[PDB]
Design a protein around this motif. Structure first.
Motif, short mmCIF file in Angstrom:
data_model
loop_
_atom_site.label_atom_id
_atom_site.label_comp_id
_atom_site.label_asym_id
_atom_site.label_seq_id
_atom_site.Cartn_x
_atom_site.Cartn_y
_atom_site.Cartn_z
N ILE A 36 -23.74 0.50 16.49
CA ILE A 36 -23.53 1.18 17.76
C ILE A 36 -22.32 2.09 17.60
CG2 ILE A 36 -22.98 0.92 20.20
CD1 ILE A 36 -24.38 -1.84 20.04
N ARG A 37 -22.52 3.38 17.83
CA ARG A 37 -21.49 4.40 17.62
C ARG A 37 -20.81 4.67 18.96
NH1 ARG A 37 -24.57 7.53 15.39
NH2 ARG A 37 -24.14 6.99 13.20
N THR A 38 -19.81 3.84 19.28
CA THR A 38 -19.16 3.90 20.58
C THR A 38 -18.23 5.10 20.73
OG1 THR A 38 -17.30 2.54 19.85
CG2 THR A 38 -19.25 1.41 20.67
N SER A 39 -17.82 5.72 19.63
CA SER A 39 -16.93 6.86 19.79
C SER A 39 -17.73 8.16 19.80
CB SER A 39 -15.90 6.91 18.66
OG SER A 39 -15.05 8.03 18.79
N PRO A 40 -17.35 9.12 20.64
CA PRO A 40 -18.04 10.42 20.67
C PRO A 40 -17.66 11.37 19.54
CG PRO A 40 -17.15 9.84 22.82
CD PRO A 40 -16.51 8.93 21.83
N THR A 41 -16.95 10.92 18.51
CA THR A 41 -16.56 11.77 17.39
C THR A 41 -17.09 11.15 16.11
OG1 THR A 41 -14.56 12.49 18.55
CG2 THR A 41 -14.65 12.84 16.17
N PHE A 42 -17.88 11.92 15.37
CA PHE A 42 -18.40 11.50 14.07
C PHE A 42 -17.50 12.05 12.98
CE2 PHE A 42 -21.16 11.94 10.33
CZ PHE A 42 -21.60 10.63 10.22
N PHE A 45 -24.40 11.41 22.81
CA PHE A 45 -23.26 12.20 23.23
C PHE A 45 -22.20 12.37 22.16
CE2 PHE A 45 -25.06 10.45 27.13
CZ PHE A 45 -25.20 11.60 27.88
N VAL A 46 -22.41 11.83 20.97
CA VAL A 46 -21.47 12.02 19.87
C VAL A 46 -21.67 13.41 19.29
CG1 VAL A 46 -23.05 10.83 18.30
CG2 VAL A 46 -20.64 11.00 17.68
N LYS A 47 -20.57 14.06 18.92
CA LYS A 47 -20.61 15.42 18.37
C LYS A 47 -21.15 15.37 16.95
CE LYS A 47 -17.82 19.56 17.72
NZ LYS A 47 -16.46 20.15 17.86
N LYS A 66 -17.57 -0.24 26.14
CA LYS A 66 -18.06 0.60 25.05
C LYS A 66 -19.58 0.60 25.08
CE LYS A 66 -14.00 1.65 23.47
NZ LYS A 66 -13.50 3.05 23.55
N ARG A 67 -20.17 1.69 25.55
CA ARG A 67 -21.61 1.81 25.64
C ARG A 67 -22.17 2.31 24.31
NH1 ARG A 67 -19.82 3.29 30.81
NH2 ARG A 67 -20.71 2.01 32.48
N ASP A 68 -23.44 2.73 24.31
CA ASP A 68 -24.10 3.13 23.07
C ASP A 68 -23.56 4.45 22.54
OD1 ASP A 68 -25.14 4.52 25.20
OD2 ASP A 68 -27.25 4.20 24.69
N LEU A 69 -23.42 5.45 23.43
CA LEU A 69 -22.83 6.77 23.13
C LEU A 69 -23.54 7.50 21.99
CD1 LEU A 69 -20.40 8.08 24.69
CD2 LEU A 69 -20.42 5.58 24.95
#
Ligand SMILES: [Mg+2]
Ligand SMILES: [Mg+2]
Ligand SMILES: [Mg+2]
Ligand SMILES: [Mg+2]
Ligand SMILES: [Mg+2]
Ligand SMILES: [Mg+2]
Ligand SMILES: [Mg+2]
Ligand SMILES: [Mg+2]
Ligand SMILES: [Mg+2]
Ligand SMILES: [Mg+2]
Ligand SMILES: [Mg+2]
Ligand SMILES: [Mg+2]
Ligand SMILES: [Mg+2]
Ligand SMILES: [Mg+2]
Ligand SMILES: [Mg+2]
Lengths: 252, 68, 117, 234
Positions: free
Chosen positions: C2-8, D26-28, D20-23
């Motif tokens: 699960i990728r909880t952060s919006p920055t990869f 919305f990840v860049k 902390k949701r799935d996101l």
RNA sequence: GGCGAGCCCGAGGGGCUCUCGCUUCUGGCGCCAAGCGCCCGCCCGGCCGGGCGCGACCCGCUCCGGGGACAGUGCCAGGU
RNA sequence: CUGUUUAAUUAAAACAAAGCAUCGCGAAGGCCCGCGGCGGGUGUUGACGCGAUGUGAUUUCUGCCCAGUGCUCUGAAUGU
RNA sequence: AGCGCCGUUCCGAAGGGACGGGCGAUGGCCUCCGUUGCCCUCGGCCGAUCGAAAGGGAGUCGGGUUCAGAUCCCCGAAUC
């Protein structure tokens, strides 16, 4: 001939804004979930004086809904706010002075300021000291809203962009005459190097299109069109009239 | 067996079966960078008649210039 | 996952340690700034001689690429004497003047007579 | 049981923070991720030509499993068993002095040039055409060519699975030409269904237009406007 | 979903058609889960250390909005 | 008015100045830079702002002319 | 065209770090400790880097010494 004074503004050599002592850019919170589907409480800690600006800056601290961290932002201080007032922000925020909220919520005739052209650019229109806009003409379908600007123009904008309710504090700043060259020197030294204000007739012919002759006269029609080249647009630029006014604007 | 068919299909580059692929490739290559490496030629017949042989050593770059 | 952060961002890949197949100079380069090349000239002038009686301190001329620790190690490994401290200056001809003050157990006059100044 | 209280957290607006949701949506994402994703979306949006809409109209997995079970025992020889057959045949022709120990080796052909040659010379009994070739121009002539030469062709999904029956990364084409004695009926059973699917309906597939699919938000918007229009009319 | 209202039919009940919400006296604090349900090695039916899910609904094909075949870009032609 | 200026022939009645005015511009914008990119200055800026000019504290006045040269608005109703 | 130029957060996969847990291996007096390799978890840079001998910047002072040194050398007394 020589490059005129008006053409040196694009070089950015000595005509830049004196930007170091300014405390920061006066913007709003960018639109998020808490400002599109509700509201959030924010506290104004103090208000400060941004140099080169007569409008007061307001340091309004927020709380991040996602991570444990207090976010500090820099609002334009509306008239009548004070330190310790819970400044609210969002869609369904109640209409008081200081509560920035979208124009679709407020009724017609709501005097607001620091509004937005397109939704999400953090405040563009009506930001100078003592200015406001008038919100009118809502639409159920095709969500648009007319705003009367300080210039008198009735701009149609979207219904989702935000605006802080009230007028900008610092109204009446141009009521006092500067009364000497010293306060004008300190004012422009605070703002930017916009003050080599020399008369174009008094300066040389090779340095300005108007100067020259044994008498200080213009010699040429100063009403110069918009199709003029660079270095030609001096005096009156695309003047549709001149002289003493008659009426208010007479522009539809 | 095939390269004459690839050549004759590339010749009439205004027809509808080719101009869609050309538009997709132009959008892809425009949203790519300016100078980079394509790991295999997109025109095998033209690359082979210019001198590409599928072996270790021959490199294909894709490059973008401006018109005018 | 699960990728909880919006920055990869970049994954932590496996960086290999450098393990070359052959050395690139066949041999370690020998130390040219050794003990015989650090301390070059003992200074036998009047102001450098008076320090031996009134200071318990020798005066030497050192190459400029050496420091206090290399001068101290060179004196202890050549003259078999202990060093209290080393004060260095750049003499304006181009060399280094080093004032080497010794331990109080040793005698600067005896060390000077053994080295011949 | 002694103390063990419950401490609920209300996740509404203007109170205790969000979990902390799935996101995921919305990840860049990086440049090449956005390239391939909006590339697939662009192929879904735009109207593809009727010579490349044939792809995504491919063979089902039961018939693909039957085709793989047929093609598993016509596999081309790898380097190890190739050198083994060379050394074994050399030792047998050196010891026993045999002239023709091998009558007919049954093996399929791979490669677009070889398959195009075999269909032009009508040696091909069946053609397997891969789906996932990114320059489609290498493939687009093969269905009409197999249709006019009368050789049946089947479009299959996955060039990697076709490369793993030829010991290579990409295979792109498989030509069934030689059949054994115990495989003629099964190959005819495959060819009958393949000619039913593709060759008897090529004139129907060539007239169809693919693509022309709007995004789901716009489809829901048009459906909401259609329901509002139906409410206004009735 | 009613701790909420809606317009009706109507005996319980039905959704024709609709809006979501759980922060407004206070210059306080608020993150790294409480609880519940399953699975392991340990004390003969007991004790320690761990994993998953609900809490935090499911699916989807653009990060979200605002323009949009216009604006601009390359070339050619005419004014100034 | 205080201030500044022709360093190495002028210190002024010259320039600047607050005040009085006029014009352009609601950001896909006004005025400019750049050989080039939607690159920069004003811009960490938004009509009590920025940009371009005339006159030059205060008081009292701002007469009359669009014939000419400029600037601007409108309509494929209409010649080129 | 090009030596190169624009730009400093803009269109970038631009953190190589530590805590805690588990597993495998090595070494010292294998009691007890220190590392290696893997996995999980956490972690906005306002973006590499330069830019002040008057800006910010922890802590040495007293006596004596030479033809030329001085808060530096000798003695004594302290601090980071
Ligand atoms: Mg006024
Ligand atoms: Mg002026
Ligand atoms: Mg002047
Ligand atoms: Mg003059
Ligand atoms: Mg001129
Ligand atoms: Mg005249
Ligand atoms: Mg390769
Ligand atoms: Mg003079
Ligand atoms: Mg007046
Ligand atoms: Mg006056
Ligand atoms: Mg007049
Ligand atoms: Mg530095
Ligand atoms: Mg210091
Ligand atoms: Mg001195
Ligand atoms: Mg002293």
């Amino acid at each position: 001939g020589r490059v005129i004074r008006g053409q040196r503004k694009g070089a950015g050599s000595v005509f830049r804004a004196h930007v170091k002592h300014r405390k920061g850019a006066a913007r709003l919170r960018a639109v998020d979930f808490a400002e599109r589907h509700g509201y959030i409480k924010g506290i104004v800690k103090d208000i400060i004086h941004d140099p080169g600006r007569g409008a007061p800056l307001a340091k309004v601290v927020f709380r991040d809904p996602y991570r444990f961290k207090k976010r500090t932002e820099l609002f334009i201080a509306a008239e009548g706010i004070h330190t310790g007032q819970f400044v609210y922000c969002g869609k369904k925020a109640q209409l008081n002075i200081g509560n920035v909220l979208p124009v679709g919520t407020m009724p017609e005739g709501t005097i607001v300021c620091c509004l937005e052209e397109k939704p999400g650019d953090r405040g563009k229109l009506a930001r100078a000291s003592g200015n406001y806009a008038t919100v009118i003409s809502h639409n159920p379908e095709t969500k648009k809203t007319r705003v009367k600007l300080p210039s008198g123009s009735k701009k149609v904008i979207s219904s989702a962009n935000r605006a802080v309710v009230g007028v900008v504090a610092g109204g009446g700043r141009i009521d006092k005459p500067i009364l000497k060259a010293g306060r004008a020197y300190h004012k422009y030294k605070a703002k930017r190097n916009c003050w080599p204000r020399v008369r174009g007739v008094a300066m040389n012919p090779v340095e300005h299109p108007f100067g020259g002759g044994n008498h200080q006269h213009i010699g040429k029609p100063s009403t110069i069109r918009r199709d003029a080249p660079a270095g030609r647009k001096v005096g009156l630029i695309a003047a549709r009239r001149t002289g003493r006014l008659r009426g208010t604007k007479t522009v539809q | 067996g095939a390269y004459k068919y690839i050549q004759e299909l590339w010749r009439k580059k205004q027809s509808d079966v080719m101009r869609f692929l050309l538009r997709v490739r132009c959008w892809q290559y425009r949203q790519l960078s300016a100078l980079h490496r394509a790991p295999r030629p997109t025109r095998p017949d033209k690359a082979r008649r210019l001198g590409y042989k599928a072996k270790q050593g021959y490199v294909i770059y894709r490059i973008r210039v401006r018109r005018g | 996952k699960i990728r909880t952060s919006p920055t990869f961002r970049r994954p932590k890949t496996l960086r290999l340690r450098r393990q070359p197949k052959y050395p690139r100079k066949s041999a370690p380069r020998r130390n040219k700034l050794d003990h015989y090349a650090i301390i070059k000239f003992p200074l036998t002038t009047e102001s450098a001689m008076k320090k031996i009686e009134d200071n318990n301190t020798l005066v030497f001329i050192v190459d400029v690429k050496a420091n206090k620790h290399q001068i101290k190690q060179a004196v202890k490994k050549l003259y078999d004497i202990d060093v209290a401290k080393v004060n260095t200056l750049i003499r304006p001809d181009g060399e280094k003047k080093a004032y080497v003050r010794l331990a109080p157990d040793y005698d600067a006059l005896d060390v000077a007579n053994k080295i011949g100044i | 049981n002694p103390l063990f209280e419950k401490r609920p957290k209300n996740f509404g607006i203007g109170q205790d923070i969000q979990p902390k949701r799935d996101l995921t949506r919305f990840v860049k994402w990086p440049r090449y991720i956005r390239l391939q994703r909006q590339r697939a979306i662009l192929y879904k949006r735009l109207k593809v030509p009727p010579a490349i809409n044939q792809f995504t109209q491919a063979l089902d997995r039961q018939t693909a499993t039957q085709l793989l079970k047929l093609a598993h025992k016509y596999r081309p020889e790898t380097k190890q068993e190739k050198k083994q057959r060379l050394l074994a045949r050399a030792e047998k022709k050196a010891a026993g002095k045999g002239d023709v120990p091998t009558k007919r080796p049954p093996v399929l052909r791979a490669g677009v040039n070889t398959v195009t040659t075999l269909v032009e010379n009508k040696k091909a009994q069946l053609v397997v055409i891969a789906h996932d070739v990114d320059p489609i121009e290498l493939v687009v002539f093969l269905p009409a060519l197999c249709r006019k030469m009368g050789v049946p062709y089947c479009i299959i999904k996955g060039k990697a699975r076709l490369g793993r029956l030829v010991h290579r990364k990409t295979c792109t084409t498989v030509a069934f030409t030689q059949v054994n004695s115990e495989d003629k009926g099964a190959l005819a059973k495959l060819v009958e269904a393949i000619r039913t699917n593709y060759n008897d309906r090529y004139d129907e597939i060539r007239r169809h237009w693919g693509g022309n699919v709007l995004g789901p938000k716009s489809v829901a918007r048009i459906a909401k406007l259609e329901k509002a229009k139906a409410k206004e009319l009735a």
